[PDB]
């Protein structure tokens, strides 16, 4: 006798999904939507290479720690990679004021061009070439941060300095300087004749007056003295004015901000892999079409959305048996 039956599909699929009322439910078809795979490398981001500081910190790079010469004139970058605890930081011990705010600024910058703003030859009445230290060695011999100059007395005199610089460029200008804190009055007079010193710095916005602090400190990198550095952004058409009768670590090079854009500073021990990606994380790059990944929260580029799940699978087909 004639008959017709109504039924549904079935196959050999072992793929499971979860529901609110039932776990591990085998279905005919499913769709994974969670990327779980990365190349374990640091790549170019859309063809543009990241700036991989090696054993150098951002401070070491910008101030010009002699061990960081590799980064003297760095090309455009997509993002910046810094180790958790770079070995080449402040060779002469001290501190960098508002360092975290500067590093934050860096995350919006893609390119500097370093320019010389005050030539070493322009220090007529001081010694501009005796400011070096064994804390900052270069090729076996004492040296110093390359982008600023440690000025000292000449002929047992330190005339008060009145030097100024007008930013005639179209770009914002990152200007760095510092002050040296000796350990005693003897070191004070020996380096800079004057016993009672100051550094004043002014711009449209800045109204600063620093005086050295003498104190007995523990040796770091063989030194009990400290260098304290400062920075500002000089607006185009504005000028910066320095006055000082000692302890001045004067600018030599500054940084034209010549490309702003989205960027970041990644903390990672990885080195440059020779690859290209559209999406980078501190532990590797992602090539995916998934809407989700679970690789790392910190991400740059065109990326999937990060999530803490180790499994996300959607059901497309029906229950299988």
């Amino acid at each position: 006798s004639d008959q017709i039956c109504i039924g549904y599909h079935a196959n050999n699929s072992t793929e499971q999904v979860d529901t609110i009322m039932e776990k591990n439910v085998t279905v005919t078809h499913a769709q994974d939507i969670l990327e779980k795979t990365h190349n374990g490398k640091l790549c170019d981001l859309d063809g543009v290479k990241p700036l991989i500081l090696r054993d150098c910190s951002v401070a070491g790079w910008l101030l010009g720690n002699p061990m960081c010469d590799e980064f003297l004139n760095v090309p455009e970058w997509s993002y910046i990679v810094e180790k958790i605890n770079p070995v080449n930081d402040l060779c002469y011990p001290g501190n960098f004021n508002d360092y975290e705010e500067l590093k934050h600024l860096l995350s919006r910058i893609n390119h500097f061009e370093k320019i010389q703003i005050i030539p070493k030859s322009s220090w007529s009445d001081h010694e501009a070439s005796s400011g070096v230290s064994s804390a900052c060695p270069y090729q076996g011999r004492s040296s110093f941060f390359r982008n600023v100059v440690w000025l000292i007395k000449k002929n047992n005199t330190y005339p008060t300095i009145k030097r100024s610089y007008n930013n005639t460029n179209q770009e914002d200008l990152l200007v760095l300087w510092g002050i040296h804190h000796p350990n005693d009055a003897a070191e004070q007079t020996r380096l800079y004749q004057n016993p009672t010193t100051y550094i004043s710095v002014g711009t449209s916005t800045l109204n600063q007056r620093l005086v050295p602090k003498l104190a007995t400190r523990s040796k770091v990198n063989g030194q009990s003295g400290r260098m304290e550095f400062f920075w500002t952004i000089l607006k185009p058409n504005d000028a910066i004015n320095f006055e000082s009768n000692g302890n001045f670590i004067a600018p030599e090079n500054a940084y034209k901000i010549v490309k702003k854009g989205d960027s970041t500073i990644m903390k990672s021990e990885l080195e440059y892999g020779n690859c290209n990606t559209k999406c980078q994380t501190p532990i590797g790059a992602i090539n995916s079409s998934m809407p989700f990944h679970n690789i790392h929260p910190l991400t740059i580029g065109e990326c999937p959305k990060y999530v803490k799940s180790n499994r996300l699978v959607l059901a497309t087909g029906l229950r299988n048996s």
């Binding site: 008959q3 039924g7 196959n11 939507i33 975290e100 970041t264 910190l298 803490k308 029906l318 229950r319």
Partner: protein, 164 residues
């Protein structure tokens, strides 16, 4: 299932039908064979494709990432920053895991609904002219050749016929 059809009054699936999700198995004087219902298979395809796309698109503007540095005397704001990034991370993680669980369940019961709706499309056509076998099958009170079966499949079955 929620609708009683899949793994219910239809005890098992057809390893034999590979043309679609829902379909027919006919048995008459011209022989046997499987036949997928395109109208209901395609509709179910549009539905879960829209479902997948609606999930992907609703979560495109999620929570982002950016690293921030803090010094040693900024532990409070460092902790605030960590707690708020972990916060959004947790609610978006919950939001994705919960969404999948919920929709996966609607999707299974969606298929169960489509099959049951197919069985009744046929049942409401073959009124007096057939008897419910109770297992997803219909025994005919007449001869249904290959042209007649097609009239059931494409919804143009003609009731003007005797049956006894």
């Amino acid at each position: 299932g929620l609708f009683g059809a899949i793994a219910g009054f239809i005890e098992g699936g057809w390893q034999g039908m590979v043309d679609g999700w829902y379909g027919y198995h006919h048995s008459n004087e011209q022989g046997s064979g499987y036949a997928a219902d395109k109208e209901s298979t395609q509709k179910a395809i549009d539905g879960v494709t829209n479902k997948v796309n609606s999930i992907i698109d609703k979560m495109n503007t999620q929570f982002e990432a950016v690293g921030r540095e803090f010094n040693n005397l900024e532990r409070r704001i460092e902790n605030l920053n960590k707690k708020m990034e972990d916060g959004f991370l947790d609610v978006w993680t919950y939001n994705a895991e919960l969404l999948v669980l919920m929709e996966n369940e609607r999707t299974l019961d969606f298929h169960d609904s489509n099959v049951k709706n197919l069985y009744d499309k046929v049942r409401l056509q073959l009124r007096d002219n057939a008897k419910e076998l109770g297992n997803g099958c219909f025994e005919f009170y007449h001869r249904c050749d290959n042209e007649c079966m097609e009239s059931v499949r494409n919804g143009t079955y003609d009731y003007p016929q005797y049956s006894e």
